[PDB]
Amino acid sequence: GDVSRLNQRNINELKIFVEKAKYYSIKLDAIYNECTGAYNDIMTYSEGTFSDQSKVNQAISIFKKDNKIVNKFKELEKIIEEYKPMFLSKLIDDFAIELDQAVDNDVSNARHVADSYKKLRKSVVLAYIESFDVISSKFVDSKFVEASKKFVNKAKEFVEENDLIALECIVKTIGDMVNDREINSRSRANNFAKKEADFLGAAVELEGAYKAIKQTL
């Protein structure tokens, strides 16, 4: 029986999300580039020797100064909040609290800032996938829903290997599908090529289901 009207409403919701979230990977890269030195310094020099306390203090400053990094995470949260309300809220608060307490010089405290940052950045990537999951799950097309669950699973496995690389690939690939650009199914990576290709395989299946919907419209 014809469910064209429902399928067009589902496509509309997906296209809105993807276009609104299209800078998600660029914005997470900007956090990565500003914080990586500081994160690595905290991990290296947090061994209780105070030998490099000044380096740890400067690394904490990168994460804390002008609330800038916290606000970058809040900007990414504002994109997903419509779709996964309170997904990131707790982890953003836990980071904010650790940053406050890091004024107390301590090796543990700084390590907790670094750990809290790493956990929150991974959750920001997962929140993109969790938002796609919720949108996909409103589709009335069973073949699209089945392909979506597989895309979500392979997306989360890719994240386990590397959060930012997975997010970059997920954002470009779903972008290509909703803008009717043929998905490239091949990884040319020297790191994570197996997991990338597995995810691209699930994306090609989803593109097939999506195109089958579009040809009924």
Numbering used by the authors: 19 to 235
In the authors' words:
Additionally, CspZ is only produced after Lyme borreliae invade vertebrate hosts and, as such, induces CspZ-specific immune responses after natural infection. Similar to CspZ, CspZ-YA is an all-α-helical protein composed of nine α-helices (denoted as helices A to I).
However, in CspZ-YA, the distance fluctuates between 2.6 and 31.8 Å but mostly greater than 4 Å. Such a distance is unfavorable for the formation of the salt bridge, suggesting the destabilization of CspZ-YA. Additionally, the three-dimensional structure of CspZ revealed a hydrophobic core between helices G, H and I where residues Y207 and Y211 are on one side, along with F176, I183 and F217 on the other side. Further, the altered conformation in CspZ-YA prevents R206 from interacting with E186, exacerbating the cavity-mediated structural instability. In Lyme borreliae CspZ proteins, the mutagenesis of Y207A and Y211A reduced the hydrophobic interactions and created a cavity at the C-terminal H/I loop and helix H of CspZ-YA, destabilizing the protein’s conformation. However, the RMSF values of R5 varied among these tested proteins with CspZ-YA having the highest flexibility (0.9–5.5 Å), followed by CspZ-YAC187S (0.9–5.0 Å), CspZ-YAI183Y (0.9–4.7 Å), and CspZ (0.9–2.2 Å).
